[PDB]
Scaffold this active site. Structure first.
Site, PDB file in Angstrom:
ATOM      1  N   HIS B 165       0.842  -1.290   0.045  1.00  0.00           N
ATOM      2  CA  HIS B 165      -0.400  -0.155  -0.363  1.00  0.00           C
ATOM      3  C   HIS B 165       0.683   1.031   0.228  1.00  0.00           C
ATOM      4  O   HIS B 165       1.487   1.481   0.828  1.00  0.00           O
ATOM      5  CB  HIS B 165      -0.910   0.145   1.302  1.00  0.00           C
ATOM      6  CG  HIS B 165      -2.354   0.755   1.135  1.00  0.00           C
ATOM      7  ND1 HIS B 165      -2.300   2.474   0.636  1.00  0.00           N
ATOM      8  CD2 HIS B 165      -3.578   0.833   0.989  1.00  0.00           C
ATOM      9  CE1 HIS B 165      -3.266   2.688   1.155  1.00  0.00           C
ATOM     10  NE2 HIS B 165      -4.025   1.644   0.561  1.00  0.00           N
ATOM     11  N   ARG B 442      14.242  -7.250  -5.662  1.00  0.00           N
ATOM     12  CA  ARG B 442      14.258  -5.420  -7.284  1.00  0.00           C
ATOM     13  C   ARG B 442      15.087  -4.644  -6.678  1.00  0.00           C
ATOM     14  O   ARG B 442      15.636  -4.357  -5.406  1.00  0.00           O
ATOM     15  CB  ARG B 442      12.716  -5.273  -7.551  1.00  0.00           C
ATOM     16  CG  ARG B 442      13.161  -3.831  -8.451  1.00  0.00           C
ATOM     17  CD  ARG B 442      12.066  -3.884  -8.958  1.00  0.00           C
ATOM     18  NE  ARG B 442      11.279  -2.253  -7.934  1.00  0.00           N
ATOM     19  CZ  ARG B 442      10.986  -1.325  -8.655  1.00  0.00           C
ATOM     20  NH1 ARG B 442      10.020  -1.445  -9.763  1.00  0.00           N
ATOM     21  NH2 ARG B 442      10.013  -0.886  -7.983  1.00  0.00           N
ATOM     22  N   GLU B 552      11.942   1.418 -18.308  1.00  0.00           N
ATOM     23  CA  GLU B 552      10.917   2.213 -17.637  1.00  0.00           C
ATOM     24  C   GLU B 552      11.173   3.243 -18.452  1.00  0.00           C
ATOM     25  O   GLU B 552       9.877   3.843 -19.773  1.00  0.00           O
ATOM     26  CB  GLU B 552      11.889   2.009 -16.675  1.00  0.00           C
ATOM     27  CG  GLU B 552      11.495   1.471 -15.251  1.00  0.00           C
ATOM     28  CD  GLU B 552      12.245   2.018 -13.734  1.00  0.00           C
ATOM     29  OE1 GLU B 552      12.390   3.587 -13.968  1.00  0.00           O
ATOM     30  OE2 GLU B 552      12.573   1.210 -13.047  1.00  0.00           O
ATOM     31  N   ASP B 589       5.587   3.904 -14.908  1.00  0.00           N
ATOM     32  CA  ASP B 589       7.208   4.353 -14.856  1.00  0.00           C
ATOM     33  C   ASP B 589       6.856   5.132 -16.132  1.00  0.00           C
ATOM     34  O   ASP B 589       7.818   6.146 -16.252  1.00  0.00           O
ATOM     35  CB  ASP B 589       8.151   3.348 -14.890  1.00  0.00           C
ATOM     36  CG  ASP B 589       8.581   2.606 -13.717  1.00  0.00           C
ATOM     37  OD1 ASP B 589       8.355   3.250 -12.595  1.00  0.00           O
ATOM     38  OD2 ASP B 589       8.402   1.455 -13.685  1.00  0.00           O
ATOM     39  N   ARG B 627       2.705  -1.690 -12.357  1.00  0.00           N
ATOM     40  CA  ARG B 627       1.724  -1.395 -11.534  1.00  0.00           C
ATOM     41  C   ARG B 627       1.683   0.488 -12.938  1.00  0.00           C
ATOM     42  O   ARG B 627       1.964   1.035 -13.356  1.00  0.00           O
ATOM     43  CB  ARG B 627       2.021   0.398 -10.516  1.00  0.00           C
ATOM     44  CG  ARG B 627       3.168   0.961 -10.503  1.00  0.00           C
ATOM     45  CD  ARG B 627       2.481   1.490  -8.984  1.00  0.00           C
ATOM     46  NE  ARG B 627       1.141   2.440  -9.648  1.00  0.00           N
ATOM     47  CZ  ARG B 627       0.692   2.700  -8.219  1.00  0.00           C
ATOM     48  NH1 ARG B 627       0.156   2.189  -7.777  1.00  0.00           N
ATOM     49  NH2 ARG B 627      -0.760   3.998  -8.713  1.00  0.00           N
ATOM     50  N   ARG B 752      10.141   9.569  -8.223  1.00  0.00           N
ATOM     51  CA  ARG B 752       9.665   8.171  -7.821  1.00  0.00           C
ATOM     52  C   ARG B 752       8.054   7.843  -8.719  1.00  0.00           C
ATOM     53  O   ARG B 752       7.526   9.097  -8.439  1.00  0.00           O
ATOM     54  CB  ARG B 752       9.397   7.274  -6.949  1.00  0.00           C
ATOM     55  CG  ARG B 752      12.137   6.932  -6.473  1.00  0.00           C
ATOM     56  CD  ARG B 752      11.514   5.934  -5.539  1.00  0.00           C
ATOM     57  NE  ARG B 752      10.929   4.588  -6.291  1.00  0.00           N
ATOM     58  CZ  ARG B 752      11.486   3.448  -6.256  1.00  0.00           C
ATOM     59  NH1 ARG B 752      12.878   4.211  -7.271  1.00  0.00           N
ATOM     60  NH2 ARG B 752      11.000   2.723  -7.290  1.00  0.00           N
ATOM     61  N   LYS B 814     -12.957  11.341 -10.817  1.00  0.00           N
ATOM     62  CA  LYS B 814     -12.678  11.472  -9.829  1.00  0.00           C
ATOM     63  C   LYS B 814     -11.560  12.729  -9.681  1.00  0.00           C
ATOM     64  O   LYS B 814     -11.315  13.133  -8.705  1.00  0.00           O
ATOM     65  CB  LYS B 814     -11.476  10.271  -9.048  1.00  0.00           C
ATOM     66  CG  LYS B 814     -12.388   9.433  -9.398  1.00  0.00           C
ATOM     67  CD  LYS B 814     -10.858   7.712  -9.034  1.00  0.00           C
ATOM     68  CE  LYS B 814     -11.798   6.267  -8.998  1.00  0.00           C
ATOM     69  NZ  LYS B 814     -10.727   5.163  -8.955  1.00  0.00           N
TER      70      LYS B 814
END
Lengths: 929, 929
Positions: B165, B442, B552, B589, B627, B752, B814
């Protein structure tokens, strides 16, 4: 097809099917799946045979054509041993399935919204008053204030005493399979079921039914320790959780009558007790070691149950806000805390001090664990190095930290949370204590006489047994204030005498919270009670058990009042009992002596008389109800039975037997469990504030007259007919019940009440329950035609009479004189058949008078849901009755031959078949007398 | 009143309420009870304040009158610290309650009976194909035989990788409270509820809501070990039992298409993995010790879960019929059996040999117990005397005795029973093994470069970092066949270098079933992958982890194909990977580098290109989805996302990230858990036999053109605007997220992906998800008006395009540019406000082009149930956005003063409020980009 099986079943029970009536459907679905399983396990041929037995029996129960019984007989007597066993197993299993279905039907049957208010509404689960309705009637109809009702309940105690299944203690494993079958079944009828869920539930149902059927190992009797552990299974299944669910309903009901507090968590409203390993009356297998083991088992189980739920409570009690008192205690425990792994499922590392409730409860868990392990080592190794301060030795020690958790939540603004699982846990602790059942000991008076006779003769002072009652009393009172012990190390002891003395030794050594009453079987006199008091004194028992006479025969009941008066007049005794006395009555016992009609009426009178004597001496009396009464029926009928008690015989304290053959119905399904607790609590409360009507003088007089006649008829048949005993041994499986075990049996008088009732239940004849009512009714009606109307008015208007007749009527509905006739024909010698015939004539006449008095054309027209349940089980029981009848012939009669069919079953003697038929018939008959 | 709260809530969401739509009702009931609790705990005044915030926010969400936001601002900025915290806690809590209600609504929402067959049906839970419908479409529409479908599923693997999370790992205790609130709520709406049950459920609901609210301790970040344990809670709550429930549905579906066997219990259809304690990319708190601890924790939990259910299985397995093989094994174990107490809850005495399955399972329990205790001692004490043959070290050892139980049942005629809990247990063992998650490691490529540079320089042979790619490859291949180790005991090591080496040491020491992939972050080259292979070889790891590059940036994606080709051309590597390679993509990414539109399209192409290269070299490729993609949405949208994948990119093996902010929705409620497993399994199966359409050439060409333009717009704003960074720091709470922690951040490029997405989600602006789509659409449409129709046809007809737009449309729903405007006004300096304004203009224009392309007038007119859920949460989130905005002002600006209201709350700073608002806003936004 399912539909075709539904069709056959539906013919058996006409009735007016609304949406909540699914019982026929349930039975069809279960039978249909079980048939598939039989085909699978044993082949199509065997499946067809079972079906054919079922069909023939169902047809026979429809029209009662004798021809159908014969065909059923021809089929069954042609089967070899292997096939017989499969068939008896199959039909026994179906009876269990039917019982589970019936439970589910009772649980979901709709409540009647507008109750008529008549006391007859309390005989039926759909109409009876729940606890709130009970509160409201007391408030609005008897003008009690809410506070008076609340206060009476807070001081009320209901104690339920569990006794052993007379025929088949069901093991925990199988019980749990039954529960899962019952759930699959309920879920299959859930509103809005997807087809895949239905398919999967279906396969689950199938699987469970099979698993239960294949739990069927058949050599040794079960040890009394194993019987007790089996008998305790219902706590895990329902009662453990059921108690706080009911006490929470009491909170809700209180709130709804304007009481704004919860029922106090430590009011001892509910108490369970047991006779399993405590009753040694006529049973020498119940030794002092047995008794010690069941006390330790009860302690082990109880602490295990608290242990096995404490981790869940720890998880919830994550809150970090606590009061000073608990903070200080937590920091104490945290400082003295072990750095290392505890081998528990959940909180295996050291608990941090910002989880204060967990710290407190962590210490409770360790204590529970040690308490449990001590008991286990004492059982298996014969002792333990685990010290007292590592465990709980008194219930207060366990309550205290839980109470501390409760207060701390309340003080920090979290009362609401306290009243969740914490409150439930507090109630469980207060209700089950450290031993979830307290154990009654029971032994017969003559054993104590024998022990004391050994003592007097060794002392050289004469023979206690020869001494008169007055001389016994005098010596007992002198020794009860004696200055030296009675028993020297060289006292000569027979094995029986030793066994009885060593029981007292176990009582002196074990904690007093393990024990309840010391019941004296066959009590007749004041000295019987003092004898037990002297033995307890001699063993210096720190908290002696209260001594409770069981007066059994009619003559003993008649002598009870003088015996109680004398006890209560003695200063030593009055001082000893401290304002309280418990007396026991045994309905079945008394009924074996004098016939059930006269025992019922005498027990009504004797209770009245003892209540009055207790008042006069300022003693609080508890009447302990032994087996066989209307109060032992379970379900709604129990509710009206309790309300029927003579005035002031409850007075805030109920103690009743929950008979082993009733425990499954009373407690197996969680809704029934809840309702059982509820009606015991509600009826007990009501009765002390709303006694039934006392009978009219004309009614007492007729009851007296009727009893003289009933007793005479019952005794001339049972005791004065020189060949009754010989008939009884042929017509019933009584002897075989003996030689396949308690022990069972000087004639009927020395035969025990359970084998008596059981033997006649097995033949569907039930003589012990009805014999004598017939002569009583006929004599009354013929002496004066007006008595018919008086008796009808008593039925309609006198609860005692109403419940007494209803129980006999339920028994007639479980009767079938065709089965008894078949047994006569197969098993009884020709010269005794007329005797059997004349008993059948009495059965018929007695039934008809009963029907006339009740105002019914048909058996149970009062209670169609009960009739329906009995009728749906009948075909299964009948198949077992026929199988049993021919099995008994084969066992008894080396002359009897029949051509046997080639073996029917695949897969992949006689005594075993008989035990199966006996157990299945008993499971289908449940309670009668 | 309840009705008045229902009224306000209903205005927020017009719609066409049938009987299964209860979501508004649920939310009203929960808010109503929570308000009572607030009044209780904190006083009427505070309750009224919360209500007033709610009312103002709900009104604002109705008509979007700015005036309502101002009043909400005035109220909130007048509260002291203490009241602010209570208010932020209250609104956060309501969001959790609303989410639980929504879960219950999704679980019981009615399925559409007649599905149109269009691929759009697979985007919505009410219309998507279940596993049987998937089987049927493949059979009847794609002409597969049932056997071909069965065979493909047997060889299929779905691997779900759980990540942390990003903002609030929810503790086990609170999770369980949420579950009980959700159940009380469901039960309150059960068909046929008695009034007392309703009253009692009501009080239970109240109590749970309070318990959860008061689980609210606020000092230290959570350790990575605690974050992992929190993150594992869903196995206990649902997944543990969910897996065999779904595999049993597969049996049922197979049966319904004519396959008459079960899905094999040991087919590895489902596998769970984790990054918790394995991902150290940019995170030095993830040490070798952390990784060791999470491996042992996973082992401890797994063996504990088997242990904690084995006693139940022992109870059921009461059967006495067994085959020879098991009989012999049972008598072995029985002879070598301990005479004495085992400290277990259930089978504490020696198990008798007539309970043979219990004897076998008794030995399994002991092994499980020892396996669990070894892990625990290794964690707490640093080692253990428990030897290898006392525990399970390989999963086969645990399967074997269970398989033996299975065969023995089958051989004795009890297959049906075997397929109950035994089968479930076998499936659990086969799915979770001895470590219920395998752990990915990782670390970023540059760390490996740094380690190897230290080595080369200590060896005196130059600097690996300075060496060209060709020279790196050459040296790596020479050392990969080297004859001596590289690392001497005097190698100089910085802390980072040591940390990276010691991770390999942990990998060499622990069992290989603890681990999955070694992921390389920021991978660019062939040598990056060989570097990790050399380090594993150097540590002599017996089963080296497979090495998986994560490419990436856009430039890295473009260089991937040549990198993979080179790897696959090298004999050492081909031999090492044995026909299999996994590559990872990271949507978020790539989107941070190039804008989400271009990252989406590039990832489509790169996957195509790598698939082809793998085929050419005869290698099986797995694409691991990181993700931020359409496949990470959860719920129905995930189903169509999976089906949208380029042809042959699944090919029987799915590996996807289940993002931490999605885990609650995916797995918290048991029906959603079941449906989540189902759509992953069904979509993966379908795709390999039914790829989506490949795009038309015109469509590729336009996609290419659009990407050039999108990337240019995204990069000119994000990287070339010299003050974008300064704006970003003022308009978002990005900096504060940092200083209240992974670590977060050389500008945006070194920031990040999670802090990037998160920061803009918090302001309801979501720039990272949409920026660039606008220029792409406009440029396409203005270059040729016909492109509007082409884009609409792509939306309607090309699943990739459809799902890509739908995700952006959900994000716009949203969004609220009023919140961003408020932040500008409060927090951004005047000279940067026009910049913020021009971004709002882009937002509007981009939204409108999207709407036009989708053929919608209003956001989400496709998906009204999703829109409804978002709208009901909005008022709570909005209250938190306003609270946060003024809190950030107070924190940042010592000049800012407002008059504070007297303290409102009873009972019986700023940074804390901010953390509460940040977590609650995140919980309400869930997944976006």
């Amino acid at each position: 097809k399912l539909a075709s099986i539904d069709a056959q079943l539906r013919l058996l029970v006409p009735g007016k099917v609304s949406e909540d009536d699914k019982l026929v459907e349930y039975d069809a679905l279960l039978l249909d799946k079980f048939l598939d399983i039989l085909q699978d396990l044993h082949g199509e041929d065997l499946k067809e045979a079972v079906q054919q037995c079922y069909e023939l029996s169902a047809e026979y129960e429809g029209k009662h054509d004798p021809k159908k019984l014969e065909e059923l007989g021809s089929l069954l007597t042609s089967l070899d041993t292997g096939d017989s066993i499969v068939i008896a197993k199959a039909f026994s299993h179906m009876l269990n399935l039917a019982n589970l279905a019936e439970e589910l039907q009772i649980a979901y049957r709709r409540r009647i919204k507008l109750k008529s208010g008549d006391f007859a509404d309390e005989a039926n689960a759909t109409t009876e008053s729940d606890i709130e309705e009970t509160f409201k009637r007391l408030v609005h109809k008897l003008n009690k204030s809410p506070e008076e009702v609340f206060d009476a309940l807070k001081n009320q105690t209901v104690e339920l005493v569990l006794t052993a299944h007379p025929t088949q203690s069901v093991r925990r494993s199988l019980l749990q399979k039954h529960g899962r079958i019952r759930n699959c079944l309920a879920q299959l009828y859930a509103k809005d079921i997807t087809p895949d869920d239905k398919q999967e539930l279906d396969e689950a149902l199938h699987r469970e039914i099979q698993a239960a059927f294949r739990t069927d190992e058949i050599r040794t009797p079960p040890t009394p320790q194993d019987e007790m552990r089996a008998g305790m299974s219902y706590f895990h299944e329902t009662i453990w959780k059921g108690v706080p669910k009911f006490l929470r309903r009491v909170d809700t009901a209180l709130k709804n009558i304007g009481i704004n507090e919860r029922f106090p968590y430590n009011a001892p409203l509910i108490q369970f007790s047991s006779w399993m390993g405590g009753d040694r009356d006529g049973n020498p297998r119940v030794t002092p070691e047995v008794t010690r083991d069941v006390c330790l088992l009860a302690r082990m189980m109880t602490s295990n149950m608290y242990f096995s739920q404490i981790e869940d409570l720890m998880i919830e009690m994550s809150m970090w806000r606590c009061n000073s008192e608990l903070r200080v205690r937590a920091e104490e425990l945290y400082r003295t805390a072990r750095k290392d792994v505890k081998h528990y499922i959940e909180f295996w590392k050291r608990i941090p001090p910002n989880q204060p409730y967990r710290v407190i409860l962590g210490d409770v868990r360790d204590k529970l664990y040690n308490t449990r392990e001590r008991s286990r080592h004492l059982l298996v190794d014969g002792k333990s190095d685990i010290p007292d301060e590592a465990v709980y030795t008194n219930v207060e020690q366990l309550l205290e930290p839980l109470e501390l958790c409760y207060r701390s939540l309340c003080d920090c603004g979290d009362h609401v949370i306290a009243d969740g699982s914490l409150l439930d846990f507090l109630r469980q602790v207060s209700t089950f204590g450290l031993s979830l059942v307290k154990l009654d000991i029971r032994q017969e008076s003559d054993r104590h006489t024998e022990v004391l006779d050994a003592i007097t003769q060794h002392l050289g002072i004469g023979s206690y047994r020869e001494w008169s009652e007055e001389k016994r009393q005098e010596w007992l009172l002198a020794e009860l204030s004696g200055k030296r012990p009675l028993i020297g190390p060289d006292l000569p002891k027979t094995e029986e005498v030793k066994d009885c003395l060593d029981t007292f030794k176990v009582l002196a050594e074990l904690p007093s919270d393990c024990f309840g009453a010391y019941i004296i079987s066959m009590a007749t006199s004041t000295s019987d009670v003092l004898a037990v008091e002297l033995l307890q004194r001699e063993y210096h028992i720190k908290h002696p058990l209260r001594v409770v006479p069981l007066f059994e025969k009619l003559a003993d009941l008649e002598a009870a009042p003088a015996a109680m008066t004398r006890l209560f007049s003695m200063d030593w005794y009055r001082n000893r009992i401290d304002g309280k006395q418990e007396v026991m009555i045994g309905y079945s016992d008394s009924g074996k002596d004098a016939g059930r009609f006269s025992a019922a009426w005498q027990l009504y009178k004797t209770q009245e008389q003892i209540v009055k004597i207790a008042k006069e001496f300022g003693v609080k009396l508890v009447i302990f109800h032994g087996r066989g009464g209307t109060v032992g029926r379970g379900g709604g009928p129990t509710h009206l039975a309790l309300l029927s008690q003579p005035p002031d015989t409850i007075n805030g304290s109920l103690r009743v037997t929950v008979q082993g053959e009733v425990i499954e119905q009373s407690f197996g399904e969680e809704h029934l469990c809840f309702r059982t607790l509820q009606r015991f609590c509600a009826a007990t409360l009501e009765h002390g504030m709303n006694p039934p009507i006392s009978p009219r003088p004309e009614w007492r007089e007729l009851m007296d007259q009727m009893a003289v006649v009933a007793t005479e008829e019952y005794r001339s048949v049972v005791f004065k007919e020189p060949r009754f005993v010989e008939y009884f041994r042929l017509a019933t499986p009584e002897l075989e019940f003996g030689r396949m075990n308690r022990p069972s049996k000087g004639g009927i008088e020395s035969l025990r009440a359970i084998p008596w009732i059981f033997s006649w239940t097995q033949t569907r004849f039930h003589l012990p329950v009805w014999l004598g009512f017939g002569a009583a009714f006929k004599h009354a009606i013929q002496k004066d035609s007006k008595n018919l109307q008086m008796l009808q008015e008593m039925y309609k208007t006198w609860p005692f009479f109403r419940v007494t007749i209803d129980l006999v009527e339920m028994v007639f509905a479980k009767g079938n004189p065709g089965i008894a006739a078949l047994n006569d024909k197969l098993l009884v010698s020709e010269d005794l058949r007329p005797f059997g015939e004349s008993l059948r004539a009495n059965y018929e006449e007695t039934k008809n008078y009963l029907l006339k008095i009740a105002g019914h054309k048909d058996l149970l027209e009062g209670d169609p849901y009960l009739k329906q349940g009995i009728r749906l089980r009948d075909p299964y029981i009948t198949t077992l009755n026929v199988c049993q009848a021919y099995t008994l012939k084969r066992i008894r009669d080396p002359n009897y031959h029949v051509t046997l069919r080639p073996h029917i079953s695949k897969e992949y003697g006689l005594e075993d078949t008989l035990i199966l038929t006996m157990k299945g018939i008993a499971a289908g008959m449940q309670n009668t007398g």
